[PDB]
Write an enzyme that holds these catalytic residues in place. Sequence first.
Site, PDB file in Angstrom:
ATOM      1  N   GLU A  35       0.818  -1.213   0.000  1.00  0.00           N
ATOM      2  CA  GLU A  35       0.000   0.000   0.000  1.00  0.00           C
ATOM      3  C   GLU A  35       0.853   1.265   0.000  1.00  0.00           C
ATOM      4  O   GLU A  35       0.507   2.232  -0.676  1.00  0.00           O
ATOM      5  CB  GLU A  35      -0.919   0.027   1.218  1.00  0.00           C
ATOM      6  N   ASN A  46      -7.955   9.344  -5.326  1.00  0.00           N
ATOM      7  CA  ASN A  46      -8.814   8.416  -6.085  1.00  0.00           C
ATOM      8  C   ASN A  46      -9.660   9.203  -7.091  1.00  0.00           C
ATOM      9  O   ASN A  46      -9.841  10.346  -6.947  1.00  0.00           O
ATOM     10  CB  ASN A  46      -9.690   7.587  -5.158  1.00  0.00           C
ATOM     11  N   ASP A  48     -12.851   9.310  -7.488  1.00  0.00           N
ATOM     12  CA  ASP A  48     -14.049   9.943  -6.948  1.00  0.00           C
ATOM     13  C   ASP A  48     -13.751  11.191  -6.125  1.00  0.00           C
ATOM     14  O   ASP A  48     -14.685  11.796  -5.587  1.00  0.00           O
ATOM     15  CB  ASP A  48     -14.868   8.945  -6.114  1.00  0.00           C
ATOM     16  N   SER A  50     -11.893  11.315  -3.194  1.00  0.00           N
ATOM     17  CA  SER A  50     -11.322  10.932  -1.917  1.00  0.00           C
ATOM     18  C   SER A  50      -9.828  10.730  -2.076  1.00  0.00           C
ATOM     19  O   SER A  50      -9.298  10.697  -3.183  1.00  0.00           O
ATOM     20  CB  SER A  50     -12.025   9.677  -1.427  1.00  0.00           C
ATOM     21  N   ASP A  52      -6.398   8.573  -0.128  1.00  0.00           N
ATOM     22  CA  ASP A  52      -5.934   7.528   0.780  1.00  0.00           C
ATOM     23  C   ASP A  52      -4.693   8.039   1.512  1.00  0.00           C
ATOM     24  O   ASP A  52      -3.797   8.647   0.892  1.00  0.00           O
ATOM     25  CB  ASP A  52      -5.570   6.240   0.034  1.00  0.00           C
ATOM     26  N   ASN A  59      -8.934   5.501   3.542  1.00  0.00           N
ATOM     27  CA  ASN A  59      -9.651   6.356   2.594  1.00  0.00           C
ATOM     28  C   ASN A  59     -10.560   7.374   3.282  1.00  0.00           C
ATOM     29  O   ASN A  59     -11.309   7.042   4.203  1.00  0.00           O
ATOM     30  CB  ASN A  59     -10.468   5.481   1.634  1.00  0.00           C
TER      31      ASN A  59
END
EC number: 3.2.1.17
Length: 129
Positions: A35, A46, A48, A50, A52, A59
Amino acid sequence: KVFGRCELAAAMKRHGLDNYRGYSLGNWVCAAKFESNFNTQATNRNTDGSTDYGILQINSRWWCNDGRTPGSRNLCNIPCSALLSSDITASVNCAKKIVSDGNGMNAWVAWRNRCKGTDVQAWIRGCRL
Ligand SMILES: [Cl-]
Ligand SMILES: [Cl-]
Ligand code: NA
């Protein structure tokens, strides 16, 4: 902070992740490697809108507040910036809530695609624990 592999294993064990909800320590170290490459300051945006955050790429759509994800939740009740600290406590405490929510570690796409079903004990082999 960029952790070493065994240093991170020891910190996660101290914070109660070994066998948490049945997931051995190697699973958590493997997830962190793919990750974030063990970097607490990692961030990724991301599609959309958002973002991380941190060593486990938690998220903002559901788990933390970053002030720029409209209509999102803050289920860990923390600013997302707390997840970037060199002290991993906030990330671990939020991850415990995520893994408890029904879908286990399948919440982490890199765990599902690169750790699940592999010899994850290899990630802690050689470490003094
Ligand atoms: Cl393991
Ligand atoms: Cl599970
Ligand atoms: Na949020």
